[PDB]
Amino acid sequence: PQVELFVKAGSDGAKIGNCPFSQRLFMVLWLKGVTFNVTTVDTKRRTETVQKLCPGGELPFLLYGTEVHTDTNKIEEFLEAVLCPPRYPKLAALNPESNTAGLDIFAKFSAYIKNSNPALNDNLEKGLLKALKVLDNYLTSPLPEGVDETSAEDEGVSQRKFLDGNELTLADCNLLPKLHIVQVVCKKYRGFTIPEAFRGVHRYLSNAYAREEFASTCPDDEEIELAYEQVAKAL
């Protein structure tokens, strides 16, 4: 069946807008290997076709054949269920812990970036750093080794590329768009970076930036920053 993902447009009404849900679903479709369209929607000037498909204005939404699906979590679950083996790869993580690691970071970032009081900034910075460290601990703790790596048993070096192993999973599709926003926005508006001491987080992001499924689905830095001009507050 025809597959079409509709996502909120950015500042010019044409490019993909900042939205971690849009990027998540783009990543899931890309990783499945299915043929699909991505189309943007300017909410201030929606096309007639879009107004008829999604009268309620929900975004992102997915057209699968002639049927419209809304709610990012429900869309993802649906895609995982219908684009399944043997024709398409299963993308669900094998370890439930992969689906909870780092889940709290984005809301801690939001609280941090939306604050304007200088002293309170420092409490919020600590909350964000603690959440990033808990993710770092997950990324540096071992999981069963994939069949394409033998270093753990051969040399004593346990390593993996992503949250759950050496392949991108649904968990990474949720988390990576959010971490990317955290990075770009915190650098711009706070001069804050994820500490180099968090090796797990840095190795993960390096490995992810080397995959087009992630790198190519990121909005450009200026667009992300622009989307935060009425969200981020100056101290």
XYZ file of C-alpha atoms in Angstrom:
235
model
C 0.000 0.000 0.000
C 0.926 3.628 -0.592
C 2.531 5.204 2.447
C 2.559 8.964 3.071
C 3.810 10.791 6.163
C 2.546 14.354 6.655
C 4.624 16.537 8.942
C 4.547 20.128 10.137
C 6.463 22.541 7.870
C 9.127 24.893 9.200
C 9.564 28.637 9.020
C 9.241 28.945 5.231
C 6.167 26.725 4.929
C 8.158 24.217 2.827
C 10.948 22.472 4.760
C 10.317 20.041 7.625
C 9.873 21.891 10.884
C 11.450 21.186 14.214
C 9.425 18.339 15.712
C 10.909 15.264 17.285
C 7.788 13.225 16.455
C 8.119 13.967 12.761
C 11.746 12.884 12.714
C 10.983 9.758 14.714
C 8.442 8.524 12.174
C 10.672 9.488 9.196
C 13.405 7.370 10.790
C 11.071 4.401 11.369
C 9.894 4.435 7.699
C 13.456 4.762 6.416
C 14.681 1.859 8.576
C 11.824 -0.388 7.441
C 12.860 -0.110 3.795
C 9.315 0.554 2.630
C 8.623 3.010 -0.231
C 7.129 6.189 1.273
C 6.434 9.854 0.740
C 7.092 12.683 3.193
C 5.069 15.853 2.685
C 5.082 19.043 4.711
C 2.082 21.006 5.937
C 2.056 24.733 6.584
C -0.546 24.995 9.381
C -1.313 28.594 8.349
C -2.129 27.568 4.791
C -3.069 23.879 4.569
C -3.817 22.451 1.124
C -7.343 21.374 0.232
C -6.215 17.750 0.113
C -4.782 17.927 3.614
C -7.878 19.711 5.002
C -10.020 16.793 3.772
C -7.650 14.048 5.001
C -7.124 15.427 8.442
C -9.913 17.806 9.304
C -8.890 17.925 12.938
C -5.414 19.330 12.278
C -3.433 16.597 13.986
C 0.266 16.396 12.880
C 2.114 14.276 12.133
C -0.328 11.970 10.442
C 0.071 8.949 8.206
C -1.898 7.831 5.160
C -1.647 4.050 4.677
C -3.569 3.172 1.499
C -6.738 5.231 1.910
C -6.712 5.208 5.714
C -5.517 8.066 7.956
C -3.668 7.329 11.214
C -3.009 9.933 13.951
C -1.061 9.907 17.229
C 2.673 9.330 16.871
C 2.814 6.402 19.305
C -0.141 4.677 17.614
C 1.364 5.279 14.153
C 4.681 3.778 15.217
C 3.028 0.734 16.747
C 0.959 0.268 13.587
C 4.028 0.505 11.308
C 5.941 -1.946 13.451
C 3.033 -4.377 13.317
C 2.245 -4.246 9.555
C 5.748 -3.733 8.107
C 7.039 -6.914 9.692
C 9.156 -9.953 8.888
C 9.899 -11.628 6.636
C 9.476 -8.718 4.194
C 10.641 -5.897 6.562
C 12.871 -5.951 9.634
C 11.497 -5.889 13.157
C 12.668 -2.617 14.759
C 11.488 -3.091 18.331
C 14.212 -3.248 20.940
C 14.921 -6.627 22.467
C 15.547 -5.186 25.997
C 12.670 -3.241 27.606
C 15.273 -1.174 29.412
C 16.241 0.321 26.044
C 12.783 1.794 25.776
C 13.093 3.697 29.084
C 16.738 4.826 28.958
C 17.004 8.595 28.625
C 13.196 9.044 28.405
C 13.243 11.815 31.024
C 15.957 13.948 29.439
C 13.817 15.953 27.058
C 11.419 17.290 29.745
C 14.372 18.238 31.980
C 15.887 20.093 29.047
C 12.580 21.855 28.465
C 12.368 23.048 32.080
C 16.001 24.199 31.908
C 15.702 26.111 28.679
C 12.388 27.843 29.552
C 13.716 29.283 32.845
C 14.886 32.867 33.063
C 16.226 33.136 36.638
C 20.049 32.927 36.780
C 20.364 31.034 40.043
C 17.550 28.595 39.265
C 19.282 27.843 35.945
C 21.995 26.131 37.934
C 19.594 23.779 39.745
C 17.932 22.938 36.408
C 21.376 22.369 34.801
C 22.136 19.811 37.477
C 18.835 18.026 36.876
C 19.634 17.792 33.147
C 23.195 16.610 33.784
C 21.949 13.862 36.156
C 19.496 12.589 33.539
C 22.239 12.580 30.860
C 24.531 10.653 33.262
C 21.859 7.976 33.888
C 21.657 7.505 30.086
C 25.486 7.432 29.939
C 25.438 4.601 32.533
C 23.013 2.601 30.382
C 25.179 3.095 27.299
C 28.336 1.965 29.125
C 26.691 -1.055 30.845
C 26.737 -4.281 28.866
C 24.039 -6.015 26.805
C 24.263 -9.404 25.044
C 26.814 -8.986 22.259
C 25.607 -8.991 18.650
C 26.818 -11.649 16.337
C 28.810 -9.103 14.304
C 31.174 -8.235 17.210
C 33.444 -10.703 19.100
C 35.632 -8.294 21.113
C 33.963 -8.955 24.480
C 34.958 -12.616 24.650
C 38.043 -12.306 22.409
C 39.767 -9.284 24.033
C 37.723 -8.206 27.078
C 36.113 -5.167 25.395
C 32.338 -5.033 25.493
C 30.949 -2.387 23.120
C 27.795 -1.712 21.035
C 26.741 1.113 18.748
C 23.232 2.136 19.846
C 20.731 1.795 22.698
C 19.944 -1.863 22.291
C 22.768 -3.271 20.234
C 24.415 -2.635 16.916
C 21.271 -1.863 14.894
C 18.981 1.142 15.164
C 15.674 0.330 16.900
C 12.412 2.126 17.597
C 13.987 3.303 20.881
C 16.700 5.176 19.007
C 14.114 6.699 16.683
C 12.410 8.275 19.705
C 15.500 9.301 21.611
C 17.957 10.584 18.966
C 15.754 13.408 17.560
C 15.276 14.643 21.144
C 18.964 14.488 22.055
C 19.784 16.332 18.871
C 17.450 19.190 19.831
C 18.942 19.261 23.335
C 22.403 19.608 21.863
C 21.650 22.309 19.330
C 19.443 24.418 21.578
C 21.618 24.211 24.676
C 24.714 25.205 22.716
C 22.949 28.198 21.134
C 21.116 29.599 24.112
C 23.241 28.503 27.080
C 26.692 27.664 25.767
C 26.081 24.255 27.387
C 27.418 21.036 26.015
C 27.082 17.397 27.041
C 30.263 16.743 29.033
C 33.089 14.938 27.198
C 33.290 12.753 30.334
C 29.999 11.113 29.266
C 31.670 8.655 26.920
C 28.622 6.501 26.392
C 26.531 9.452 25.247
C 29.261 10.787 22.985
C 30.028 7.420 21.383
C 26.283 6.929 20.776
C 25.824 10.312 19.131
C 28.970 9.842 16.991
C 27.688 6.455 15.827
C 24.267 7.931 15.092
C 25.537 10.936 13.158
C 27.347 8.404 10.885
C 23.993 6.912 9.845
C 22.010 8.759 7.202
C 18.717 7.658 8.670
C 19.475 10.007 11.603
C 21.718 12.676 10.097
C 19.631 13.219 6.944
C 16.354 13.497 8.877
C 17.577 16.250 11.218
C 16.315 19.754 10.476
C 19.189 22.231 10.018
C 20.540 23.927 13.125
C 19.068 27.336 12.265
C 15.562 25.922 11.927
C 15.781 24.185 15.345
C 17.106 27.366 16.937
C 14.380 29.480 15.328
C 11.697 27.127 16.706
C 13.076 27.901 20.199
C 13.039 31.712 19.950
C 9.676 31.801 21.831
C 10.553 28.908 24.098
C 14.157 29.499 25.332
C 14.549 32.373 27.726
C 17.547 34.581 28.305
C 18.974 34.638 31.860
